[PDB]
Protein backbone atom coordinates (compact mmCIF):
# COMPACT_ATOMS: atom_id res chain seq x y z
CA UNK A 1 0.00 0.00 0.00
CA UNK A 2 1.47 3.40 -0.98
CA UNK A 3 4.85 3.27 -2.69
CA UNK A 4 6.25 4.06 -6.12
CA UNK A 5 4.22 2.54 -8.94
CA UNK A 6 6.47 2.64 -11.96
CA UNK A 7 5.95 0.86 -15.25
CA UNK A 8 8.53 -1.91 -15.04
CA UNK A 9 8.26 -2.58 -18.79
CA UNK A 10 9.43 -5.85 -20.31
CA UNK A 11 9.22 -5.47 -24.08
CA UNK A 12 5.64 -4.40 -24.96
CA UNK A 13 4.53 -5.61 -21.47
CA UNK A 14 3.95 -2.86 -18.82
CA UNK A 15 3.62 -4.57 -15.40
CA UNK A 16 3.52 -1.67 -12.92
CA UNK A 17 5.80 -2.64 -9.98
CA UNK A 18 5.26 -0.82 -6.67
CA UNK A 19 8.49 -0.08 -4.88
CA UNK A 20 9.38 1.74 -1.71
CA UNK A 21 10.47 5.22 -2.87
CA UNK A 22 13.75 4.34 -1.13
CA UNK A 23 13.92 0.68 -2.33
CA UNK A 24 17.37 -0.41 -3.29
CA UNK A 25 17.82 -0.33 -7.05
CA UNK A 26 19.67 -3.51 -6.11
CA UNK A 27 16.36 -4.63 -4.55
CA UNK A 28 13.96 -3.22 -7.11
CA UNK A 29 16.02 -5.48 -9.37
CA UNK A 30 15.47 -8.43 -6.97
CA UNK A 31 11.79 -7.76 -6.44
CA UNK A 32 10.93 -8.20 -10.13
CA UNK A 33 12.87 -11.41 -10.77
CA UNK A 34 10.54 -12.94 -8.17
CA UNK A 35 7.68 -12.03 -10.52
CA UNK A 36 6.69 -12.88 -14.13
CA UNK A 37 8.53 -16.03 -15.43
CA UNK A 38 9.82 -14.00 -18.41
CA UNK A 39 11.59 -11.90 -15.75
CA UNK A 40 13.53 -14.64 -13.93
CA UNK A 41 14.87 -15.59 -17.39
CA UNK A 42 18.36 -15.52 -15.83
CA UNK A 43 20.27 -14.12 -12.81
CA UNK A 44 20.30 -10.54 -11.47
CA UNK A 45 23.78 -10.43 -12.99
CA UNK A 46 22.18 -10.43 -16.46
CA UNK A 47 19.26 -8.28 -15.36
CA UNK A 48 19.42 -4.61 -14.28
CA UNK A 49 17.07 -1.71 -15.10
CA UNK A 50 16.93 1.20 -17.51
CA UNK A 51 14.90 4.36 -16.98
CA UNK A 52 14.08 4.68 -20.61
CA UNK A 53 13.65 8.45 -20.90
CA UNK A 54 11.75 9.58 -23.98
CA UNK A 55 14.72 8.62 -26.10
CA UNK A 56 16.68 5.64 -24.62
CA UNK A 57 19.74 7.71 -25.49
CA UNK A 58 18.34 10.01 -22.88
CA UNK A 59 17.30 7.02 -20.83
CA UNK A 60 19.81 5.63 -18.43
CA UNK A 61 20.93 2.63 -16.40
CA UNK A 62 20.35 3.08 -12.68
CA UNK A 63 22.59 1.65 -9.94
CA UNK A 64 21.70 -0.89 -7.27
CA UNK A 65 22.24 0.02 -3.62
CA UNK A 66 20.82 3.41 -4.62
CA UNK A 67 17.31 4.55 -3.76
CA UNK A 68 14.63 5.12 -6.39
CA UNK A 69 13.75 8.39 -4.70
CA UNK A 70 17.26 9.28 -5.84
CA UNK A 71 15.63 10.26 -9.11
CA UNK A 72 12.81 11.40 -6.88
CA UNK A 73 10.73 9.10 -9.00
CA UNK A 74 6.93 9.45 -8.46
CA UNK A 75 4.68 6.58 -9.57
CA UNK A 76 4.12 5.14 -13.07
CA UNK A 77 7.51 6.28 -14.38
CA UNK A 78 9.16 4.11 -17.07
CA UNK A 79 11.57 1.40 -15.84
CA UNK A 80 12.66 -1.34 -18.28
CA UNK A 81 13.88 -4.90 -17.53
CA UNK A 82 17.41 -4.61 -19.02
CA UNK A 83 20.36 -7.05 -19.08
CA UNK A 84 23.04 -6.17 -16.55
CA UNK A 85 25.48 -8.05 -18.82
CA UNK A 86 28.16 -5.51 -19.81
Amino acid sequence: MVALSLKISIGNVVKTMQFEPSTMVYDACRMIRERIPEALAGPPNDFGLFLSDDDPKKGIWLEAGKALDYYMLRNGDTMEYRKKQR
Binding site: V2, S5, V13, V14, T16, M17, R35, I36, E38
Partner: protein
Amino acid sequence: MREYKLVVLGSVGVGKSALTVQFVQGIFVEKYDPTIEDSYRKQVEVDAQQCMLEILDTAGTEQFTAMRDLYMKNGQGFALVYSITAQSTFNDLQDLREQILRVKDTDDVPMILVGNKCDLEDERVVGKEQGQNLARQWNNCAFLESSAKSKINVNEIFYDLVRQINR
Protein backbone atom coordinates in the same frame (compact mmCIF):
# COMPACT_ATOMS: atom_id res chain seq x y z
CA MET B 1 -7.10 0.63 -36.94
CA ARG B 2 -9.35 0.44 -34.01
CA GLU B 3 -8.18 1.62 -30.65
CA TYR B 4 -9.42 -0.28 -27.64
CA LYS B 5 -8.59 0.90 -24.11
CA LEU B 6 -10.10 -1.62 -21.64
CA VAL B 7 -10.32 -1.30 -17.84
CA VAL B 8 -9.61 -4.72 -16.30
CA LEU B 9 -11.26 -4.36 -12.86
CA GLY B 10 -10.60 -6.88 -10.06
CA SER B 11 -10.80 -7.10 -6.27
CA VAL B 12 -7.64 -7.50 -4.28
CA GLY B 13 -6.81 -11.23 -4.36
CA VAL B 14 -8.44 -12.07 -7.73
CA GLY B 15 -6.06 -11.93 -10.71
CA LYS B 16 -6.34 -8.87 -12.93
CA SER B 17 -2.94 -8.91 -14.59
CA ALA B 18 -2.82 -12.71 -14.18
CA LEU B 19 -5.10 -12.75 -17.22
CA THR B 20 -2.95 -10.11 -18.89
CA VAL B 21 0.13 -12.41 -18.84
CA GLN B 22 -1.20 -15.61 -20.42
CA PHE B 23 -2.45 -12.99 -22.89
CA VAL B 24 0.54 -10.65 -23.64
CA GLN B 25 3.40 -12.88 -22.41
CA GLY B 26 1.70 -16.25 -22.49
CA ILE B 27 2.61 -17.26 -18.89
CA PHE B 28 0.42 -17.93 -15.83
CA VAL B 29 1.95 -18.23 -12.30
CA GLU B 30 0.73 -18.61 -8.72
CA LYS B 31 2.21 -15.21 -7.88
CA TYR B 32 -0.43 -12.80 -9.05
CA ASP B 33 1.27 -9.76 -10.61
CA PRO B 34 0.90 -6.63 -8.33
CA THR B 35 -2.21 -4.43 -8.05
CA ILE B 36 -1.02 -0.98 -9.15
CA GLU B 37 -2.49 0.09 -12.47
CA ASP B 38 -0.79 -2.08 -15.10
CA SER B 39 -1.71 -2.04 -18.77
CA TYR B 40 -0.75 -4.58 -21.39
CA ARG B 41 0.18 -4.06 -24.93
CA LYS B 42 -0.83 -6.58 -27.50
CA GLN B 43 -1.64 -5.89 -31.12
CA VAL B 44 -4.78 -7.84 -32.04
CA GLU B 45 -7.16 -8.28 -34.95
CA VAL B 46 -10.93 -8.48 -34.48
CA ASP B 47 -12.80 -10.09 -37.30
CA ALA B 48 -9.96 -9.03 -39.50
CA GLN B 49 -9.95 -5.64 -37.85
CA GLN B 50 -6.53 -4.57 -36.72
CA CYS B 51 -7.02 -3.06 -33.28
CA MET B 52 -4.39 -1.02 -31.38
CA LEU B 53 -2.61 -2.69 -28.43
CA GLU B 54 -3.67 -0.64 -25.23
CA ILE B 55 -5.49 -2.12 -22.24
CA LEU B 56 -5.60 -1.07 -18.55
CA ASP B 57 -5.61 -3.21 -15.35
CA THR B 58 -6.53 -1.11 -12.27
CA ALA B 59 -6.58 -2.71 -8.79
CA GLY B 60 -7.26 -1.75 -5.14
CA THR B 61 -4.51 0.98 -5.11
CA GLU B 62 -5.48 4.44 -3.94
CA GLN B 63 -2.21 5.73 -5.33
CA PHE B 64 -3.12 5.13 -8.90
CA THR B 65 -6.84 5.82 -8.19
CA ALA B 66 -6.80 9.27 -9.95
CA MET B 67 -5.39 7.54 -12.95
CA ARG B 68 -7.58 4.50 -12.40
CA ASP B 69 -10.52 6.96 -12.30
CA LEU B 70 -9.65 8.42 -15.67
CA TYR B 71 -10.00 5.10 -17.42
CA MET B 72 -13.50 4.70 -15.93
CA LYS B 73 -14.39 8.03 -17.45
CA ASN B 74 -13.28 6.82 -20.90
CA GLY B 75 -14.11 3.21 -19.98
CA GLN B 76 -13.77 2.12 -23.62
CA GLY B 77 -13.96 -1.48 -22.37
CA PHE B 78 -14.54 -3.00 -18.89
CA ALA B 79 -13.43 -6.48 -17.89
CA LEU B 80 -14.61 -6.98 -14.32
CA VAL B 81 -13.26 -10.32 -13.04
CA TYR B 82 -13.69 -12.07 -9.68
CA SER B 83 -12.49 -15.45 -8.43
CA ILE B 84 -15.05 -18.23 -8.96
CA THR B 85 -13.99 -19.40 -5.52
CA ALA B 86 -14.15 -15.83 -4.08
CA GLN B 87 -17.61 -14.45 -3.35
CA SER B 88 -16.14 -11.55 -1.39
CA THR B 89 -14.86 -10.19 -4.74
CA PHE B 90 -17.75 -11.23 -6.99
CA ASN B 91 -19.79 -9.25 -4.53
CA ASP B 92 -17.42 -6.23 -4.53
CA LEU B 93 -17.18 -5.65 -8.28
CA GLN B 94 -20.89 -4.80 -7.91
CA ASP B 95 -20.20 -1.28 -6.57
CA LEU B 96 -17.04 -0.73 -8.49
CA ARG B 97 -19.34 -0.97 -11.45
CA GLU B 98 -21.59 1.76 -10.13
CA GLN B 99 -18.37 3.83 -10.07
CA ILE B 100 -18.22 3.33 -13.83
CA LEU B 101 -21.93 3.86 -14.43
CA ARG B 102 -21.47 6.86 -12.18
CA VAL B 103 -18.95 8.49 -14.54
CA LYS B 104 -20.26 7.01 -17.79
CA ASP B 105 -23.80 7.85 -16.67
CA THR B 106 -25.21 4.51 -17.84
CA ASP B 107 -24.74 0.74 -17.79
CA ASP B 108 -24.94 0.73 -21.56
CA VAL B 109 -21.14 0.82 -21.50
CA PRO B 110 -18.93 -1.87 -23.14
CA MET B 111 -18.49 -4.38 -20.29
CA ILE B 112 -18.25 -8.09 -19.43
CA LEU B 113 -18.51 -10.18 -16.25
CA VAL B 114 -15.88 -12.90 -15.68
CA GLY B 115 -15.58 -15.89 -13.37
CA ASN B 116 -11.99 -16.82 -14.14
CA LYS B 117 -9.87 -19.49 -12.44
CA CYS B 118 -12.50 -22.06 -13.39
CA ASP B 119 -9.63 -24.46 -12.70
CA LEU B 120 -10.68 -23.91 -9.06
CA GLU B 121 -14.24 -24.74 -9.89
CA ASP B 122 -13.21 -27.57 -7.69
CA GLU B 123 -13.93 -24.90 -5.10
CA ARG B 124 -16.47 -22.91 -7.23
CA VAL B 125 -18.15 -20.39 -4.87
CA VAL B 126 -19.52 -18.13 -7.57
CA GLY B 127 -19.87 -19.74 -10.97
CA LYS B 128 -21.22 -18.57 -14.31
CA GLU B 129 -24.49 -19.36 -12.58
CA GLN B 130 -24.20 -16.72 -9.92
CA GLY B 131 -21.88 -14.95 -12.24
CA GLN B 132 -24.57 -14.89 -14.91
CA ASN B 133 -27.23 -14.41 -12.27
CA LEU B 134 -25.15 -11.43 -11.42
CA ALA B 135 -24.43 -10.43 -15.00
CA ARG B 136 -28.16 -10.57 -15.43
CA GLN B 137 -28.60 -8.41 -12.38
CA TRP B 138 -25.97 -6.16 -13.98
CA ASN B 139 -28.39 -6.31 -16.86
CA ASN B 140 -26.94 -9.47 -18.40
CA CYS B 141 -23.49 -7.87 -18.44
CA ALA B 142 -22.48 -10.72 -20.82
CA PHE B 143 -20.53 -13.20 -18.66
CA LEU B 144 -17.79 -15.63 -19.48
CA GLU B 145 -16.01 -18.37 -17.51
CA SER B 146 -12.21 -18.31 -18.00
CA SER B 147 -9.05 -19.89 -16.62
CA ALA B 148 -5.89 -17.80 -17.00
CA LYS B 149 -4.27 -21.17 -16.33
CA SER B 150 -6.08 -23.33 -18.88
CA LYS B 151 -6.26 -20.12 -20.96
CA ILE B 152 -10.05 -20.31 -21.34
CA ASN B 153 -12.19 -17.38 -22.50
CA VAL B 154 -9.08 -15.30 -21.75
CA ASN B 155 -9.13 -13.93 -25.33
CA GLU B 156 -12.93 -13.89 -25.81
CA ILE B 157 -13.26 -11.34 -23.05
CA PHE B 158 -11.59 -8.48 -24.91
CA TYR B 159 -13.29 -9.90 -27.96
CA ASP B 160 -16.68 -9.32 -26.33
CA LEU B 161 -16.26 -5.59 -25.61
CA VAL B 162 -14.67 -4.81 -28.91
CA ARG B 163 -17.85 -6.08 -30.43
CA GLN B 164 -19.54 -3.56 -28.11
CA ILE B 165 -17.11 -0.65 -28.55
CA ASN B 166 -18.09 -1.16 -32.18
CA ARG B 167 -21.33 0.46 -31.12
